[model samples]
Target: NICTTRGVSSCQQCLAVSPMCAWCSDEALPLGSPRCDLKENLLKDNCAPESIEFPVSEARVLEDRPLSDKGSGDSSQVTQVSPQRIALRLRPDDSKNFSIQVRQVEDYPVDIYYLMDLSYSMKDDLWSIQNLGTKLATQMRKLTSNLRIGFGAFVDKPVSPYMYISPPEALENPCYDMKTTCLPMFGYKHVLTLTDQVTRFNEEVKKQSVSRNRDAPEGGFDAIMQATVCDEKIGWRNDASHLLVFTTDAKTHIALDGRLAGIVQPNDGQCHVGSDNHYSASTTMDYPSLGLMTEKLSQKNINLIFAVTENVVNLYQNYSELIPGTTVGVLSMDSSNVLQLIVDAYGKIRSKVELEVRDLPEELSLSFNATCLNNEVIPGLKSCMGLKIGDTVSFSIEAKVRGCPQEKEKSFTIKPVGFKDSLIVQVTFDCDCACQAQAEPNSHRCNNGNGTFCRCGPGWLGSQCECSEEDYRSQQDECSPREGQPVCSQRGECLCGQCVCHSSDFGKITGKYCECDDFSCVRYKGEMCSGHGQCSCGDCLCDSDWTGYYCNCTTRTDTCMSSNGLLCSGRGKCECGSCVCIQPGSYGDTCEK
Candidate 1:
């Protein structure tokens, strides 16, 4: 039978990438800015198109975590939720994997219960039936590896005023021909227990039985229920999948329609078990209830195989549904391949896995913004676009279980309903655009934020989402926050989904985030670094040194040492954020001689 290791899988709704990616660039502009493409409506004139560029997707694989015990309080939809970010990398080794296993058994025995019709008109058929046990076994052995057989028979009820009892002594021997005298007089009977011994099977068939019934309603239904439920009596292998093959040539009773025959009795259905370890049925029921019968058989996983003559084809279909996995094959009473038909049915039923999938949803409104975890499938291989909600996606997903180890690769064809429902109908050609550290020379054209301008944050390299460190340090200012973005940068850890303030003394930059350091306001001379600088990381540095709030003044230009100096020794740039230094070439104070 076909088996699968993969379990329940489903496609979920798509989500947008995080807000950090919103300021990324698509095309590299002058200031480390790359061009970005975004809908004019999404940002609503509040943010530039360059600010909302890189759009990534995520995959939601449910059941990634272990489920909690039932008694635990963490058993709700909210607690069990997990989100998966879809990475755009594809592995090439997934295509050619093979899973194959084979099982070999010697002399696998089967328990077969033979239920036959013994109406008086089959005396010629009786002779054939007498040798049936030995002949059937011998013929089957030639075709199969090894098989154990069993036999049972049934006839209609003969009690009450239904049948003309004749001399009332026909109950003893209901056979017209004394030559077939060993056959039963009437009534249904399970003549023998299912066993592997050919001699015992033959002995059971030798005691041929004939049943007496006035009308077309035979005891087939009741006989079937009794045969199946009597597991001990039938000697079925508890470990093996039991096969019950019934061969009959009689019109049995139709359900609910047999009440007019003065047999209006309801079927109590209490005969599935036997006191003597053999199957026995109470005369209190009519036909075995199909619903009840099927429920019992399915629980045991027993497969019932019906080998019937042509006349009962339509009738058996109704009965087949009653027993799930029950198979029926129509053979001519005059046909010689009765054994082959039964054998084929067994193999076919046991060889395939029958499964069904729910349909696709209608109103499938997906944007190109969605990204897959892996997109390496042959272009157009994975297709699902333009779908409405509630449409079903049904198709066979074939996978080999066991038994056929030498076979080739197995394929699972997933064909959804509509052509538009095909997710990847068109091939997505690459634009030679791959994520890079820094924008290649003339890689893409200008923008601010993510679009046509270059906007580099501090030391970031790329034209787009690329950021390098030296970008901010090379400039004369601390990275400044713009609009809804962070200024000192989000490089510090963000706990509770918010950026923590970097360390800045003033009591550790305390706030919703401890991201500030105690160094932004320095104390140089006496009053906060001669009131010309700020303390950064506990050192009296300058925000453009002597410029801006808290440092707000410059060193007096007239107080020139005139010894050996340049303007601020040319050591620092004249910017409003911080100072630029010329360092070792000049001394302090001012330029003079």
Candidate 2:
């Protein structure tokens, strides 16, 4: 964009037109002079050099503290990222770059919620294993002492086909008659919120028993909605790695499963746990869709672990590919290998540190090049894997703006998966230049310098040196030959204000004003003027004794003289140097008879 217009009276009006405008600030120029223009035009129009102000983009890092590391001591504050803040200035369609680092730290804080299935098929295995909570918490403490655990359970939706709701005793307990009075069927139960005491988890899980249901499919996704969304009620921490271990031994009931029971309202993708700590919307809401599950988990920085039996492993395995921060592990019939599977699963969660961006503008683009494990550079890769504890990865980030944004400033955050540290970037645009220097309409210094001069040279004359003196005098003085005729009568070129007549082959073009030539006359007998007279302009003057078209006839009649003193010897006439005697017998030159 350019800033040049005749109506631009102020610097603000000029700069508002475009970013390429610069104001001339010379004090010697008159008020009739225009000062707002580009550098190219302003210099040609004789504006001062030191009076122009041109501003460009600027960038500075506010703080770039080095990458954080675990100390050599037992416990230390670890920082996994660097360059905590920045103050950047940019213009429209401009780009800027900065380097960054993300490292994996050892023994980071973690928070986990254990969601398990409590169907009738899982009853025999859960006889006294509610104490499995302490088992999981104790073993997981090997990696992190700052770990916390919570528990929840799910069965099936309490409807006709999924549960026995008609009879009195069946309403109280889904399996009342045969195998002993069982717990009533329900969708989900929040048994315990997150806690630091390992024994508290064991005591909370022991209070509940397995419930029976008719359908083989379990309400697993329905439970995920409540446990993932109720952040405040579940005591989710901001400084810890989030994990949700989901267990299901049977097939899953998905979004439209509630439609089979005539409940048509879609899942609200929110928490709806009742005061009794149960999912009260089982008949009122459908199951959560796949889109809801993926977005919520990523937004809260939670990793999902699908811990299921081998019979239903194929279904949960697909979740690993669709959702980020997901892992699939095969559990034995009664969770015999659950202890070791989790230890191996945590390794999967911390192995890769992915560079993520959030809150970016639509007009901005950010690209990355990461330095991987082998010291080789890889472009367009935001993640690097095969990493272990205390491994650092370096990256170069670049940002470009496609067009001018309406808002002046915007910011974005860069962080890693399962880590609390991040880098905040703030960028402001500098679209115009501002200065208070003065301007003069016409300066005396301009005449002294070649760049900005007021007077024209000898060959030219104008206020801005516009016209040439040589061309002026040529047309003003020597341009006309006669009083009202063009130079050389329009037949010659004028160089030094005089005629240089044009050349011709038919005649010699020689005259005071290229008027005429001797060769441009009548030709007879293939000779000019018939070789008997000189041609003047367009005429021929005969000699004394020559008098014919070609000068071939003689005018003297002495050749026709006879005895009588007559010009044609008394014949009729004498012409063409021969006698044409009109007397009948006087045909000869003399009439001697």
Candidate 3:
């Protein structure tokens, strides 16, 4: 009933247990000791030294390079993270430990998308922000020089209660009350995609006229979702630090606000902006939920920043707390200080590297520990703040196998939070041994090879690893039951040309050469053979006159006859001396019809 029990009687199967047991090739093994058991268990049983075939977890680095540094770029291909590609060998309870060098190289890359509220309330702020692309890019040039800026703007939902549709003029310009002929209010307007030219960004923003919206809370979450999901439309970069600056002066609108205008369908979080640089489904799709906003932002690896007026800073700060890799900034009334705001916020974000795994395998658990300046190592340190630009940190990543996965070899990726570049790790599981392989019949890598592990040891030579140290046991050979079978049927020790039957904890092992046991028969009251029969091979031979299986029931039938001398009252048949009535409603000792 346990591993290596009745089902297994050979070397090939001895090592195939729930714990994946080992096999002993020593002929001098003590009587009643299992040749197949856990490696330690057999060694504890005093099996021959180095004769137990034990499996192990094997791991070796397949690919590697020197740790990448800043000076590493001009001399050779830059590798911000060392060992860009690695192969892992894993097994349960064995961990593959490695150090990943996360270097912050100069002149890396930056892709910033400025999502601004284009409502009429920020009419003056729009003009001030027109100069941001030129000024901000100029300031960022000192930091890295490689930079691209994109722009997107949003008002409220361009529908009832949010904007006017009563008069055709009202539809064209809701700004008539302010005596200004502003453009139609829209949800999200994609101005200019990411561009290296700062002048082009200015040109696009200069022409953007602030539209009017009636709601105090603009559709900020909707705009954020659109810009995040519409990566292609907004020109999100892959190898760049993605920055999304959300500029607004008022509180934001969240998921359910669109229901006021009968917008019931939830936001799909897809690219709905058309070639004309306009959001098409602004009226159809409802405002994105806060959870959806965070999801899409993370999906696109966009680091977010909420730049709002000081009066409404708390709201954005609350939102920033809920979202990771995001910041909140207080904006000036005219937004003249936006250039500085972006530079400082971007600097704050650029100074730190937080590792995050996009996805992982089920049977593997990967964790990180950081070893930073002054030889200080922090466990569970995913993010290290207050990091200077010239600093370097070692992130010790450990990937341990919890169980076996469906596939033997698979790949996964880990990247810095909100950063594009990633490190790919492919793990090859070593959960199974090749004990049955046809190669070198006795590879030393595995212990007492399975039955196929047919290599013989010193002074002992055969196809079955049967060479005994004495070279005299098999010489006289007497314990074997027959030809082509093992000594003592593997149930006893062969000594002095005779079989010394092995004993067990479960039941007696009897027969000429220890060939039988009493545990494998039908049980009655939890006793083997129902305490009335003897077991042969696997069947029961009942005692005298007993007929049912295990001889639990008697063959007598006269007791079932009625006083009138009619068996079963002539309504039933006798089975094991009991009346089995054939007619319905027949009951009792004899059948009462």
Candidate 4:
């Protein structure tokens, strides 16, 4: 998150840092300058005209003052409403930072790939698994109409280290059999591509026969990584939600754990499936690590569903948390809950939303606060759960940047839970140039007020310094207007070269030199401050009983009196809006008599 303590000179500068930030122009508060926040909703709920004691940004210093008995408002406590709310001033080597929130709006298309383990133990389960295709098709229709399903299978690597490769009987059939009906052992085989034909899915599963292996831990991660990176082979749809379900009755081997087999080369995270339906690098490459599996899954926008026996349920659950959008389900001995597991996992993932940042710059820091259903706010939370269909949520994000990158422009994206649209942010740095600080250093006394001069400096030419070479310009005088016309457009007096614009009967004028009007302040329900509070300059000076950006909220007991029932302990007065305690030592919500 970006630092909220930094001070900005103007509203325009504050907004230039981030679009999520909002400026509070109430000058009567203890802080003299306008307040800005990284969390906009918090500012609106807490900092109001009726509630002067509210939280501000962490990077800023909050001040406490003793309430005075007099009624004259401080000169700095004046309000101004203008359309230009953000001000950003760039130094030579400085860069500005901010954050954004991305949310899933609606349901999209879905594509699933069933990667199953073909071990001797799963032989009985295969009979019931043949009908999983039709059942899954029916179950997925409830979530989205557009859906596609595919199939893949995996066993131990076909080598001496992974299986018994010595004799013909052991190599062909690890289990004793008169005539082996099992297919040859393999690391991974892409059986079918994603298809909409439900009957084709059933036919593909029936064609798959059990394969034999000598080890207890199967090559699960190897098959998973191949399925993920081999996007073209898997036929993944970019605009659809992708799910990869792995069904097995045993644990799996990870990256470094494969060294016992003398296979030390790590998985290259690429496609190794050959035309003959076998892992070409199975003998040379080690199994993939859990870290690599998690990274690849997120990069490909695939949700992994691990359906294993009850004994291994906890094992997969522990791995699921390490990987985002992953879930584990207890698979029956005969795979009875395969279809329901898929449905339940899908519903759980689609219920809520999560934001993941990509290609973030090195010098920038990002953080998030989410507001889920029922106005439940979770601070520093990147994800929210337990949301319902048609429900909408929001996140408050803050990003801070320190220095500039080698590139003049940098871009990043915010992606939601499922395979959906992304929120992109592009930043362009404003750095200093050699000519920016260059000026005509020599000054000459000229015109009516001073003595005449002879020769001018490097950039200056002509007599009395009237003209200049090298294309030079002079800074505007403090009390002078832009066009050299009357200061403040002659609407009001120009003090110290800044505009103190004039005020009209129905409205007020404001800005650096009173160049702006009251229309700049935000309007509520088509009316300025809902036609209740007065628009002072560019901001709303709400009445004692109203609050909000447009003075639309009503004052309640919760905002003033304490839970114990005390009106500032009768030691102070409640004027305009907030409490003004006169007690020597007592203060706070109710003055704590």
Candidate 5:
């Protein structure tokens, strides 16, 4: 009697109605009843019930902006494909879904800065570089009309263990005793800022004579670190490609080696260039490590070309490979091979540009799959290597969080191999619960103190404290039940008394009651539009070269002339899709053929 009055037909229906209700199993009654009667009576009737916890959180993407030239400076080259900035918002408890679109475009600007070692061992090389400025300018003009050049020099740290400061004259010029005109040994000096005037570069370089160092290992590391950080003084253009050439005939010093000079201070990566154009920290800091140098060079968008003698080529080769967009070139004693080396290295580096991601958070994981211009698919590749100039490629990136970290937001960066432009991504994870505010609210008196009520009172098994015929009908009907079956025709989940159709293995299944499949759309040769077009809303969106509902017709005239290997029966004009008969009398499929 109670089950019929309460409209609870079965145990499942009783459990589904309200958490306060339970199925009563009593031998005396011979049939169980849906009871919200009392706790004592429910226990006596062997009643049991449980609560189902639904998801209280969801994940979503918040911001996705198009490519823009935001951070690059005026001197930097303008790129065809603007880099982008993406932001995502995710719930701590759920996984997120989003897509990234990567594209490639051609012909950016370029910049070149030559940083050469000025040790006395490279004296002949210095003379060879005297007329280098103008010749290099002419050579680079062929590759790109927009180009700027700069010059810098380095020997060794001008301090005690690094240099013999014993004789003050020798400190200034180790070749002083040899009656040779030599500039003082220095860590690094900006000889000339980047400029388009090739003659000025020649003048600046000619003014720079060779210097002498006490050790075979030069201060090349200190010089490289400064050149990369001193962007303003060096006149780095944000919109152009940056190239740095380092030429040396001997080995070089790296990080932690300054302790031998009693210089225990580590190299602080920054611009130490003063108005005097010399590294201010020459004697105060140690040489930078290869890893640190690589980071600084990459961040500054500098492509490194190490032109060293064959003696130390292998060493620089192993070191240069650690840095992106870097190459090693064998330099002759007279620096005769420098120009061709720059040209060849530039061609190789630009032709095989790749994509790189940096500063990714440890809590997240990322993988990339790319499709190159020739429709070649490269799987398991994080970067697009060996891509030709003017060719475009697309990378599909999948990023996911392993678990929510204590911090709610994290940021990362992405950019091309040789380009300065970067794509910044800021991910914000949601760690809050919507029900936290009401987890413990003011309690309300219900059922005349019979018990505590989570929601409605007596005579009301509804959303509110009132019930009617509408409430009963709504409660009984779920997923818009069809023929006594659940909603979505049992093919999908039911929510709020409606069906949300699920997807099929072949394609999408969609309709009011999950009744439609992808089969209704136009098909050619049993394939959906012959794979030449996309199926959208159960219809074919054909390509420009095709027509017809099923994408079976051709717009080209050549295809219409050959019908089953017949040339329109030699009776009509072959126009695009069909044969246009010459005479009105010709009225068959092929002009009455």
Candidate 6:
């Protein structure tokens, strides 16, 4: 009895009052019971439901947007039959200026070593250096008020008495290859230390003199290594910037080239003493192996700048990739451009330098182009001569990042010389990640997160969706017949509803439907209305208005007598109160045969 009252069990009372358990007041009853009952036998068809239901139209897959331009920049050029490319633009993490209140710290001091190639061939370069200290100081002041400069020079190794030994010839001091007797000697020198004043830098530079080498190229490779690793004597600042400006004219040797001279040893990666108390091993390390140097420098947060003559600058340019944030500026080997070279190089060194860590999008790849200075309308590194603080470089990094969460951020930066001034700007993204929706051919009615809607394609517009009135004013303007539509019969104006025949000469005058025709009077033996059918509007009407099938039909016969001369002749027969043709023609006021 309680079961029956509580509706927990199928009892007589529930079966009596609401036979389907509709009287159940208990939450224990499962849905689909009388509480969720459906109309009897309603679930029989696929369209019917066992419970609640609503009308639903089947959805068609919408893939109106082509797969082309999937991951590339060429959006307009695409092929219908090939694999489409996808294009995406990935923005930086921060697209705006970032000013953080990060305090300055002198936790790390910098070690800078200037390695110069001073063989007889580089006399101009040597002379420029003799007075380069002041200009270097002024230029570096722009980089940081607190800075220092160091100096060193290198030449090739000396070997074999023929390479240079005879005391008399050595004593000759002949700085001429024409002299026949010369020594090929390559050695290193420890030039200067960290000094804030230009005079001291100049003094050290003046104290330096041209060194002789046995060959055209010097042993600068070995000297560079010694300077770089020999941190102690090179007087690298413990709390300042570490920069190396390698000035050279002749191409230097690598790990293997030094072996040819029987110096057969990999210059150990360390700082070693050199001539003039300046480091040498590192000063002469292979110049081409910038990748190795980058790794070495990145560890010290130091930056390298190759300021060489135009003749040798290209050789250093190759190091750009190896050394992050490193640059090579050209100068005349004759020393004429040395001042400008140092100025330009230092400007670039402490310039508005930024670094980027590519966080490519899931939908796109990453490509980077940077310019050190400004150029023109073109978007490439060539336009970037260099950078100045507060200067912004316009760049577009794209990515598809489809299906990515809304409001996402992706980007990072690099500061080489001025680590304290270095900064990173994060990028923000506004993504409208909607799936492709199907639409009428050539339409731009994109899905707006709701029900279906219509819109004109990129170029055209109308209702019932026709182009325009001016576009359809003439016979030429009317488009050809489409599926489930009609082609205009000549001599008629085709409106939205039907065609209006111009004259009654070929048809029974009627309403806008243009259904009734006077073709019941005309007849033909050969082609009545060409091969298609008899033209019923104004000319000879053939079966299906084909002009070639019967008598050569005309488009309009308003004032002419047909060659058959049958007004209502063989073309038509009398039917009821009118002349109805037995086979081909029809007209008015005559049953003439």
Best of the candidates, lDDT: 3
lDDT of candidate model 3 versus the reference? 0.74
Candidate 6 on 291-334: residue-level lDDT in tens? Answer: 55555565555666676666767776875655566778776767
Candidate 1 deviant stretches above 4 angstroms: 1-108, 142-146, 165-167, 170-187, 254-280, 317-323, 331-337, 355-593
- Worst ten in a row by lDDT for model 2: 435-444
lDDT (Cα, 0-100) at 6 in candidate 2: 50
Cα deviation of 443 in candidate 6 (Å)? 63
My TM-score estimates for the predictions, one after another, are 0.41, 0.66, 0.68, 0.59, 0.61, 0.41
- The alpha-carbon lDDT assigned to residue 429 of candidate 4 equals 47
Candidate 6 TM-score, true structure as reference: 0.41
On residues 1-593, what C-alpha lDDT tens digit does candidate 5 reach at each position?
A: 34235665323344334333444432233244443333444565554422111122233444334433322323333343333567766544334433344443333456788998888877888788888878987887766776788999888888767675756677766787888777776778888999888888878877778877777988888888888999999998877778888888898888888898788887777787888987898878778888888788778888888889999999988887777778899999988989999989887777665677888888877777776657787876756656555555667667766555789778987777667556677887644322223321223343233322224444443332233234344443345446566567666864444466777677776765665566557777878887657876578878988777877867665555544566566777766567777765666656645
Q: Give the candidates in order of lDDT, highest first.
A: 3, 2, 5, 4, 6, 1
Report RMSD (Å) for each prediction in the order shown. 21.5, 16.0, 22.9, 31.4, 33.0, 25.5
| Model 5 / residue 408 / CA error / Å | 4.6
- Cα lDDT listed for each candidate: 0.44, 0.73, 0.74, 0.66, 0.68, 0.46
Q: What is the alpha-carbon lDDT of model 5 when measured against the actual structure?
A: 0.68
> lDDT tens string, model 3, 1-593?
35446344344455334335666666455867656676777778888766555655544554466544443144345556666777767554467688776667667678889888988878899888767877887898887657899988888888999898867788897888768899897888898889898889888888888888876888888888878888888888766778899899998888878788999998876788888878889889898887888778777888998899999999889889898888988898898788889988988886887887866888788788889765689898876877776567778888777665667788888777785556788777654444344433554433345323344454444323454555653542656676657877787775544567767687656555556666567888677667778887567888776767767787776767876688898888977778999878888787744
Which candidate model has the greater lDDT, 1 or 6? Answer: 6
- Residues 1-593, candidate 4, lDDT per residue (tens digit)? 33245555233344545544444433233343345455454264455643222222222112222222221233232111111112222322333433333333334467889999999889877888888878888887777677799999999777767776757776666664535567767888899989888778999998888888877988888999999998888899876778898899888888787788788887777888788767789888988888888788878888888889999989888888888888888888888778888888777777767887877878667778777778888889987878764455667766655544456457666676555445555544443222112211222343232321224443433434443445433322333446556566666775334566677886777666466676667788888888768766678888777788788876754555654666565767654345678888977766764
- Candidate 2: RMSD to truth: 16.0
Candidate 3 segments whose C-alpha is farther than 4 A from its true place: 1-53, 66-78, 438-593
Selected candidate, larger TM-score, 3 vs 4 = 3
| Residue-wise C-alpha lDDT for candidate 1, range 1-593, written one tens digit per residue | 00011111110000011111222333322332212323342244344444333333222222233212221232132111111111111111111111111111113334566666666654445556555566667765643434567766666655544454666555555554343453433445666777667778666666665555556656667767776666666676543436777766666764554455455666654554455433343344456567866655654446677777778877887777665566788766644555676667656554422221123122111111111223222221222222221122122111112221222222121112111111111111111123332343233332233432233444433423244445433221333343345543553544323455555433555333333455445544467766666555445555542554445566445343233444444554433322344455644334221
